[PDB]
Structures are given as C-alpha cells and as structure tokens.
Amino acid sequence: KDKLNPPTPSIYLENKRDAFFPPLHQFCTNPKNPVTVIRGLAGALKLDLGLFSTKTLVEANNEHMVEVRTQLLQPADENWDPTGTKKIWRCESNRSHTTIAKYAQYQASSFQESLREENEKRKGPFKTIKFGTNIDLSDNKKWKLQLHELTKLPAFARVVSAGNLLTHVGHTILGMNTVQLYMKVPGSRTPGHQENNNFCSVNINIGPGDCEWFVVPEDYWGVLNDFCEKNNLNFLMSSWWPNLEDLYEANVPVYRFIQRPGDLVWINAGTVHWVQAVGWCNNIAWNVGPLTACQYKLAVERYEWNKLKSVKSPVPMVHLSWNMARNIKVSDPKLFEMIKYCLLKILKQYQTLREALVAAGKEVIWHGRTNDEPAHYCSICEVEVFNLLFVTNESNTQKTYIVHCHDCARKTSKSLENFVVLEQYKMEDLIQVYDQFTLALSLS
Ligand SMILES: O=C(O)CC[C@@H](O)C(=O)O
Ligand SMILES: [Mn+2]
Ligand SMILES: [Zn+2]
C-alpha cells in the first residue's frame, strides 16, 4: 500500500507569528502525528545557527568530550552485513572518545577529501566513518550564548518550560533536560530507538548539509521488537538498522523525510526512529514531556517495561508523579486519573512494605530529605527507589547512604540485619499530597 509510505506531517513556518501560533503546539502533541517536521523554523525566528557551527564550537570549548561511533558507510537506506552478501538488521558501531577540536579536524578533512575525489573523476566493500555523538552542552558557563539562543524557541519546544514534565522532575537528567550536540559526516547513523522513557524529542539541523529520517509510529514498536528478538538483537540496547523490505512485508508504515538546515523535527511520544546524515552537518537535540495523557501513559509504560528488561530508566517516574501532584494543576480528566491511579499504587505498595517491616520488628529511621535532591536508584539493580531507602549499617555509620531497594537488600541480608531502613517522607504528608490532588477545571 501507499499507506505504507505515508506523507510526513509537515508545517511550513515563515515568521515569528507562525512559530508562536498555538495550533502548531497542538499539532505537534497530537498523538495521531508520530512526527512533525517544522520547516523553516530557524529562519522564521532568526535563530543564529552559526552559534552551533563546528568553527564556533572549536573556539568555545576545543577540549570538550565527544563520543565517537565508528561505522560503515552504507548505501542509501540499506544495511548490509560486512561481506556485502545480505541485508541485516545488526549494524556495526564501535565506540570511543575524542574532543571537539579533533573531531572538527576530521569533519573538515573528510569534506576536503570528498571534494578531491569528486575531482579525481571516475555489495561492498565499505569505507569506515566516524560520527561525533552525545556532546554534552549542559554547562551554562561553557555554552552561555548557545543555550540563550534556544530560549528564542516557542515555549513548548524549549529545554525548560512550565509545561515540560522534564522541567518538573526537579533535577538534571543529562541529555534529556540538557542539550546534546551531534557532529556529522555523510553516513553518520543513529540506529533505531525510542527515546528514554518514550519522551518526545526535539532536533534542529544546524547544517550545512541535510539529514534523512526514518519514522515508525509507536503502536508498531512491538513488531520491531519481535524483529530484533528474532534477529538475536536487544531492541533497547543493541544497534540495529531496519530492513525496509522487512518492514514493508510486515505492513509497517514508514515515514521518511529530509531535514534541512534550520528545520526542527518533533518526534512524538514513543515514536520509533533512525537517522542518517546525507551531507556534512551538526544537530542539536533534547527531550520534552508535554502534559498529556498520551505522554504520561507511554512514559509510565516504558518505565515498567525497563524493569522487566533490566534496563535503567533515566526518568524517575515515581519522583515525577509526586512532583506533578504537588505542583501541577491538572485539568485533563484522562491525564488526571492516570496520575491519581499511579500515586495510589505507590502509596499502597509503600504502606504494605512499611507495615511488613514494622511488624517484623525492623526499625524505620526518620531521615528526611534535602529539597531538590534527585530521585534515588538502587546501587545494584538500578531500579528507582522511593521514600524507604535500604542502606547498610556501615554505609549509614559512614553517612555515605548508598541506596538499595528492598529486594536487593533482602537478597544480600536475609533478615535485613545488615541494613537500616531510612524514611524520607512521612506517610501523613504523602497521604495529604494525594488527597489534595484533585481535577482542576479548564474550559479549554
Ligand atoms: O541527530 C541524530 O542523529 C540523533 C538525534 C535523534 O535521535 C533525535 O532524537 O533528535
Ligand atoms: Mn532520538
Ligand atoms: Zn535493587
């Protein structure tokens, strides 16, 4: 079907009015639109993309760290096994580190070398390329002008905003509520994935070259998971590059489009995607969590799925949920009932655990909390741990407070005799937050 190669939801901006126009906000967050390409976004805002040029980055922080992925330069939209014999899903992507100055040097000489080849005139085997990924632009002192330029965006697409759930986490989640930079040469590939905890993603192409994007709606992610599992690949942890003929045969629709310099790509919640550089360019990206039932639901679902797959969730959805209930007036009936349900479950599980401890003669020690203290995770299994923290007798005495979850503490120490139980929140206070959390009226 042509329904298997659908058109890209695409908004064409001319000026600031178009960018700040509220139906643009609603369009991007509509669950029916897996991706929105906002064309001409930088131009409409007079964004200085030059602040993100390789030349400026070198001058700014030439020793800054870059995660290098070394890859094969693959043809078009395909991924071949190294012997050029068959198209496979697994892609080779070895990791090392470099600096902006060193990667910049390669980016520039790669282009000069391509110019000479174009002037030398005229299955693999395949050349090797390097992709500069995940460059951390969280330090406002090192990247003042860069980060300030992005406050010019409409609020819904900003790294920080009142309506961004990731703003409401209350602490830094690297690469999610902080900007990541990518420095690319032709063929630089970001393999298939969903965002961390299915949060939306915002990507701007700095240029000067284009990127090519591949997008599959969230509700087909199970199909791609089976493909991975049948191909001996971890959907969440392995590097894979879909066979478009496999997807077509399985009746999976694939959105496919070009992102030009200054185009902003909005990846909606849970949308599966992979990307390749067509030319030489940089990109900047971060996540955003719109206050919708769809975003919260997909975030919760991935959070729970990660536990089953023994994968850490970068977004602490328990911590977030209490912050939402404490600080956000929620007027969507569906969203409200989702949050209320989740808090009630947290609350009851917590009450059950606490009572089991008390009834077994285990003491619960009041530990309180520092405000804006990040969520905790289990030092062993990396699950989020909320309120009741399990700390060894020695870590307690040393006041290092190395957190464990209950299961891991119990597996270590059968009667928890090697652990103390630290309580960060009084129950009455949590019950109060829950009770005071009611549906706000909005006429919108
Ligand atoms: O630009 C890339 O290659 C990766 C970025 C993409 O995963 C995004 O979510 O913005
Ligand atoms: Mn992404
Ligand atoms: Zn654990």
Short mmCIF file of N, CA, C and O in Angstrom, two decimals, residues 287-372:
data_model
loop_
_atom_site.label_atom_id
_atom_site.label_comp_id
_atom_site.label_asym_id
_atom_site.label_seq_id
_atom_site.Cartn_x
_atom_site.Cartn_y
_atom_site.Cartn_z
N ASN A 287 15.03 16.40 24.95
CA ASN A 287 13.68 15.88 25.09
C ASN A 287 12.74 16.87 25.73
O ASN A 287 13.17 17.82 26.37
N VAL A 288 11.45 16.60 25.58
CA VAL A 288 10.38 17.40 26.15
C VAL A 288 9.25 16.45 26.52
O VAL A 288 9.01 15.49 25.80
N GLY A 289 8.57 16.71 27.64
CA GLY A 289 7.42 15.91 28.04
C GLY A 289 6.15 16.74 28.18
O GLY A 289 5.90 17.35 29.24
N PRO A 290 5.33 16.77 27.12
CA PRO A 290 4.10 17.55 27.14
C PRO A 290 3.15 16.99 28.18
O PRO A 290 3.12 15.78 28.38
N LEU A 291 2.40 17.87 28.84
CA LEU A 291 1.42 17.45 29.83
C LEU A 291 0.19 16.88 29.14
O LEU A 291 -0.84 17.56 29.05
N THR A 292 0.30 15.66 28.64
CA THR A 292 -0.84 14.96 28.05
C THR A 292 -0.93 13.56 28.60
O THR A 292 0.08 12.99 29.01
N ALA A 293 -2.14 12.99 28.58
CA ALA A 293 -2.35 11.58 28.94
C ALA A 293 -1.49 10.63 28.11
O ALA A 293 -0.99 9.63 28.61
N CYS A 294 -1.32 10.94 26.83
CA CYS A 294 -0.55 10.07 25.95
C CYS A 294 0.92 10.02 26.39
O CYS A 294 1.50 8.94 26.49
N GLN A 295 1.51 11.18 26.69
CA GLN A 295 2.90 11.22 27.11
C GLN A 295 3.12 10.50 28.45
O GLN A 295 4.07 9.73 28.59
N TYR A 296 2.25 10.77 29.41
CA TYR A 296 2.40 10.19 30.74
C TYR A 296 2.24 8.68 30.67
O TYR A 296 3.06 7.94 31.22
N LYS A 297 1.22 8.23 29.95
CA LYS A 297 0.96 6.81 29.79
C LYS A 297 2.15 6.08 29.15
O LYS A 297 2.61 5.07 29.67
N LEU A 298 2.67 6.59 28.04
CA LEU A 298 3.78 5.94 27.34
C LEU A 298 5.06 5.96 28.18
O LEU A 298 5.88 5.04 28.14
N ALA A 299 5.24 7.04 28.95
CA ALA A 299 6.36 7.16 29.88
C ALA A 299 6.27 6.12 31.00
O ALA A 299 7.26 5.45 31.32
N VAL A 300 5.10 6.01 31.60
CA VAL A 300 4.88 5.00 32.63
C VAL A 300 5.12 3.61 32.06
O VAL A 300 5.82 2.80 32.67
N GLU A 301 4.55 3.34 30.89
CA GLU A 301 4.67 2.00 30.29
C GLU A 301 6.12 1.60 30.02
O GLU A 301 6.52 0.47 30.31
N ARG A 302 6.91 2.53 29.50
CA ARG A 302 8.30 2.21 29.19
C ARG A 302 9.08 2.04 30.48
O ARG A 302 9.93 1.18 30.58
N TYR A 303 8.76 2.88 31.47
CA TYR A 303 9.35 2.77 32.81
C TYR A 303 9.19 1.37 33.40
O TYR A 303 10.13 0.82 33.98
N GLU A 304 8.01 0.79 33.23
CA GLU A 304 7.71 -0.54 33.76
C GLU A 304 8.35 -1.62 32.89
O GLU A 304 8.86 -2.63 33.41
N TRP A 305 8.37 -1.39 31.58
CA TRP A 305 8.98 -2.33 30.66
C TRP A 305 10.48 -2.43 30.91
O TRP A 305 11.05 -3.51 30.85
N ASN A 306 11.11 -1.30 31.22
CA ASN A 306 12.54 -1.27 31.51
C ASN A 306 12.91 -2.16 32.70
O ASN A 306 13.94 -2.83 32.67
N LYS A 307 12.06 -2.18 33.72
CA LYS A 307 12.27 -3.07 34.88
C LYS A 307 12.33 -4.54 34.47
O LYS A 307 13.21 -5.27 34.90
N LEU A 308 11.39 -4.95 33.63
CA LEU A 308 11.38 -6.31 33.11
C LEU A 308 12.63 -6.65 32.29
O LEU A 308 13.08 -7.80 32.29
N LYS A 309 13.18 -5.67 31.59
CA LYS A 309 14.31 -5.88 30.69
C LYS A 309 15.63 -5.58 31.38
O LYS A 309 16.68 -5.56 30.74
N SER A 310 15.57 -5.33 32.68
CA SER A 310 16.74 -4.99 33.48
C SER A 310 17.48 -3.79 32.90
O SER A 310 18.71 -3.81 32.80
N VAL A 311 16.74 -2.75 32.51
CA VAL A 311 17.33 -1.53 31.99
C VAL A 311 16.96 -0.33 32.86
O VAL A 311 15.80 -0.17 33.25
N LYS A 312 17.92 0.53 33.16
CA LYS A 312 17.64 1.71 33.96
C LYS A 312 16.78 2.74 33.21
O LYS A 312 17.00 2.98 32.03
N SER A 313 15.79 3.30 33.90
CA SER A 313 15.02 4.47 33.45
C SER A 313 15.68 5.77 33.86
O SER A 313 15.76 6.08 35.06
N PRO A 314 16.13 6.58 32.88
CA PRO A 314 16.71 7.89 33.20
C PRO A 314 15.70 8.84 33.83
O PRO A 314 16.08 9.73 34.59
N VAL A 315 14.42 8.65 33.54
CA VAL A 315 13.38 9.46 34.17
C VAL A 315 12.74 8.70 35.35
O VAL A 315 12.13 7.66 35.16
N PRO A 316 12.89 9.24 36.56
CA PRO A 316 12.30 8.60 37.75
C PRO A 316 10.80 8.86 37.83
O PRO A 316 10.37 9.88 38.37
N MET A 317 9.99 7.95 37.29
CA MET A 317 8.57 8.27 37.12
C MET A 317 7.81 8.35 38.45
O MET A 317 6.75 8.97 38.51
N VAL A 318 8.35 7.74 39.51
CA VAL A 318 7.72 7.89 40.82
C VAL A 318 7.96 9.30 41.35
O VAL A 318 7.02 10.02 41.70
N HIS A 319 9.23 9.70 41.36
CA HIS A 319 9.61 11.05 41.76
C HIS A 319 8.81 12.11 41.00
O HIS A 319 8.31 13.08 41.59
N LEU A 320 8.68 11.90 39.69
CA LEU A 320 7.99 12.85 38.81
C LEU A 320 6.52 12.93 39.16
O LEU A 320 5.97 14.00 39.29
N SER A 321 5.90 11.77 39.38
CA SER A 321 4.48 11.73 39.66
C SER A 321 4.10 12.52 40.92
O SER A 321 3.10 13.23 40.93
N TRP A 322 4.90 12.39 41.98
CA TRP A 322 4.65 13.17 43.20
C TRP A 322 4.87 14.66 42.97
O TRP A 322 4.13 15.48 43.49
N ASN A 323 5.89 15.01 42.19
CA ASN A 323 6.09 16.41 41.83
C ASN A 323 4.93 16.98 41.01
O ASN A 323 4.53 18.12 41.23
N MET A 324 4.37 16.19 40.10
CA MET A 324 3.19 16.63 39.35
C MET A 324 2.01 16.90 40.29
O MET A 324 1.33 17.93 40.20
N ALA A 325 1.78 15.96 41.21
CA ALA A 325 0.67 16.08 42.15
C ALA A 325 0.87 17.24 43.11
O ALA A 325 -0.10 17.85 43.56
N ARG A 326 2.12 17.53 43.43
CA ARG A 326 2.41 18.62 44.36
C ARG A 326 2.24 19.98 43.68
O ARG A 326 1.75 20.92 44.31
N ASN A 327 2.63 20.08 42.41
CA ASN A 327 2.90 21.38 41.82
C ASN A 327 2.16 21.71 40.53
O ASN A 327 2.24 22.84 40.05
N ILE A 328 1.46 20.74 39.94
CA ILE A 328 0.84 21.00 38.64
C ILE A 328 -0.67 20.83 38.71
O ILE A 328 -1.18 19.78 39.11
N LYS A 329 -1.40 21.88 38.32
CA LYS A 329 -2.85 21.78 38.23
C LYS A 329 -3.18 21.03 36.96
O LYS A 329 -2.76 21.40 35.87
N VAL A 330 -3.93 19.94 37.11
CA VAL A 330 -4.19 19.03 36.01
C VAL A 330 -5.66 19.06 35.67
O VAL A 330 -6.50 18.67 36.49
N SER A 331 -5.98 19.54 34.47
CA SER A 331 -7.36 19.73 34.05
C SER A 331 -7.84 18.70 33.03
O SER A 331 -9.02 18.67 32.70
N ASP A 332 -6.93 17.86 32.53
CA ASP A 332 -7.38 16.78 31.66
C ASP A 332 -7.81 15.58 32.50
O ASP A 332 -7.00 15.00 33.23
N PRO A 333 -9.10 15.21 32.40
CA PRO A 333 -9.71 14.12 33.16
C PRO A 333 -8.95 12.80 32.99
O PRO A 333 -8.74 12.09 33.96
N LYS A 334 -8.53 12.51 31.77
CA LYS A 334 -7.82 11.26 31.49
C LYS A 334 -6.44 11.28 32.13
O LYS A 334 -6.05 10.34 32.83
N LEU A 335 -5.69 12.36 31.89
CA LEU A 335 -4.36 12.50 32.48
C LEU A 335 -4.43 12.46 34.00
O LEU A 335 -3.65 11.76 34.65
N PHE A 336 -5.38 13.22 34.56
CA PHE A 336 -5.57 13.25 36.00
C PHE A 336 -5.78 11.84 36.57
O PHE A 336 -5.16 11.48 37.56
N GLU A 337 -6.65 11.04 35.95
CA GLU A 337 -6.96 9.73 36.52
C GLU A 337 -5.76 8.78 36.42
O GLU A 337 -5.58 7.90 37.26
N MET A 338 -4.94 8.96 35.39
CA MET A 338 -3.72 8.16 35.26
C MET A 338 -2.77 8.43 36.43
O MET A 338 -2.29 7.49 37.06
N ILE A 339 -2.48 9.70 36.68
CA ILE A 339 -1.60 10.11 37.78
C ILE A 339 -2.13 9.68 39.14
O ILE A 339 -1.39 9.17 39.96
N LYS A 340 -3.41 9.91 39.36
CA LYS A 340 -4.06 9.55 40.61
C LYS A 340 -3.96 8.04 40.86
O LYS A 340 -3.66 7.60 41.99
N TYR A 341 -4.20 7.26 39.82
CA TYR A 341 -4.06 5.80 39.87
C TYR A 341 -2.65 5.39 40.29
O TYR A 341 -2.46 4.55 41.17
N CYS A 342 -1.66 5.99 39.63
CA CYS A 342 -0.27 5.66 39.90
C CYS A 342 0.14 6.00 41.32
O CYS A 342 0.80 5.20 41.99
N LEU A 343 -0.25 7.19 41.79
CA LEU A 343 0.10 7.59 43.15
C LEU A 343 -0.52 6.65 44.18
O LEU A 343 0.12 6.30 45.18
N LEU A 344 -1.76 6.24 43.94
CA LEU A 344 -2.47 5.34 44.83
C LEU A 344 -1.75 4.01 44.92
O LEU A 344 -1.66 3.42 46.00
N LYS A 345 -1.22 3.55 43.79
CA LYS A 345 -0.45 2.32 43.76
C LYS A 345 0.87 2.43 44.51
O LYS A 345 1.24 1.53 45.27
N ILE A 346 1.60 3.52 44.27
CA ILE A 346 2.81 3.81 45.02
C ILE A 346 2.49 3.82 46.51
O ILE A 346 3.15 3.15 47.32
N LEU A 347 1.44 4.57 46.85
CA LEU A 347 1.05 4.76 48.24
C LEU A 347 0.77 3.43 48.92
O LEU A 347 1.30 3.15 49.99
N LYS A 348 -0.03 2.59 48.27
CA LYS A 348 -0.40 1.30 48.86
C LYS A 348 0.78 0.33 48.95
O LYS A 348 0.91 -0.38 49.96
N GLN A 349 1.62 0.29 47.93
CA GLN A 349 2.81 -0.56 47.95
C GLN A 349 3.73 -0.15 49.10
O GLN A 349 4.25 -0.98 49.84
N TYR A 350 3.91 1.16 49.24
CA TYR A 350 4.71 1.74 50.32
C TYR A 350 4.16 1.39 51.71
O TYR A 350 4.92 0.98 52.60
N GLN A 351 2.85 1.53 51.89
CA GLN A 351 2.17 1.17 53.13
C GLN A 351 2.34 -0.31 53.45
O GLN A 351 2.55 -0.69 54.61
N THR A 352 2.25 -1.15 52.43
CA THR A 352 2.40 -2.59 52.62
C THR A 352 3.81 -2.96 53.08
O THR A 352 3.99 -3.74 54.03
N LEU A 353 4.81 -2.38 52.43
CA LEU A 353 6.22 -2.62 52.76
C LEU A 353 6.53 -2.11 54.18
O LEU A 353 7.11 -2.84 55.00
N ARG A 354 6.13 -0.87 54.45
CA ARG A 354 6.38 -0.24 55.74
C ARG A 354 5.81 -1.06 56.89
O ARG A 354 6.49 -1.31 57.89
N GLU A 355 4.56 -1.49 56.74
CA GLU A 355 3.91 -2.34 57.75
C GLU A 355 4.57 -3.70 57.92
O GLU A 355 4.58 -4.24 59.03
N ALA A 356 5.10 -4.26 56.84
CA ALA A 356 5.76 -5.56 56.93
C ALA A 356 7.04 -5.41 57.73
O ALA A 356 7.39 -6.28 58.54
N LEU A 357 7.74 -4.31 57.50
CA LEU A 357 8.94 -4.01 58.25
C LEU A 357 8.62 -3.82 59.73
O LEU A 357 9.24 -4.44 60.59
N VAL A 358 7.66 -2.95 60.02
CA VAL A 358 7.30 -2.64 61.40
C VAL A 358 6.87 -3.91 62.14
O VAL A 358 7.22 -4.12 63.30
N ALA A 359 6.13 -4.77 61.45
CA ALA A 359 5.58 -5.97 62.05
C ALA A 359 6.66 -7.02 62.28
O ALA A 359 6.50 -7.92 63.12
N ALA A 360 7.76 -6.92 61.53
CA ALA A 360 8.89 -7.83 61.71
C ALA A 360 9.89 -7.25 62.70
O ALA A 360 11.00 -7.77 62.84
N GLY A 361 9.53 -6.17 63.37
CA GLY A 361 10.41 -5.57 64.37
C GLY A 361 11.60 -4.82 63.80
O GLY A 361 12.55 -4.52 64.51
N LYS A 362 11.54 -4.51 62.50
CA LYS A 362 12.57 -3.69 61.86
C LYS A 362 12.26 -2.20 62.07
O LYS A 362 11.14 -1.76 61.80
N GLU A 363 13.25 -1.43 62.51
CA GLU A 363 13.00 -0.02 62.81
C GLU A 363 13.06 0.83 61.54
O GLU A 363 13.94 0.66 60.69
N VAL A 364 12.12 1.76 61.42
CA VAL A 364 12.14 2.71 60.33
C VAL A 364 12.73 4.02 60.85
O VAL A 364 12.18 4.63 61.76
N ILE A 365 13.85 4.44 60.29
CA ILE A 365 14.56 5.61 60.80
C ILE A 365 14.22 6.87 60.01
O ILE A 365 14.40 6.92 58.79
N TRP A 366 13.74 7.90 60.70
CA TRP A 366 13.43 9.16 60.03
C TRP A 366 14.72 9.79 59.52
O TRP A 366 15.66 10.02 60.28
N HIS A 367 14.75 10.06 58.22
CA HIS A 367 15.96 10.52 57.54
C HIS A 367 15.71 11.86 56.86
O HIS A 367 16.64 12.61 56.55
N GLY A 368 14.43 12.15 56.63
CA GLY A 368 14.02 13.35 55.93
C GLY A 368 14.61 13.46 54.55
O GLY A 368 15.05 12.48 53.96
N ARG A 369 14.64 14.69 54.03
CA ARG A 369 15.17 14.91 52.70
C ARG A 369 15.63 16.35 52.51
O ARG A 369 15.13 17.27 53.18
N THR A 370 16.60 16.53 51.63
CA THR A 370 17.01 17.85 51.15
C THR A 370 16.16 18.23 49.95
O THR A 370 15.99 17.43 49.03
N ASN A 371 15.62 19.44 49.94
CA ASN A 371 14.79 19.86 48.81
C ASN A 371 15.60 19.93 47.52
O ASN A 371 16.79 20.28 47.54
N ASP A 372 14.95 19.56 46.42
CA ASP A 372 15.58 19.46 45.10
C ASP A 372 16.64 18.35 45.03
O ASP A 372 17.42 18.28 44.07
#
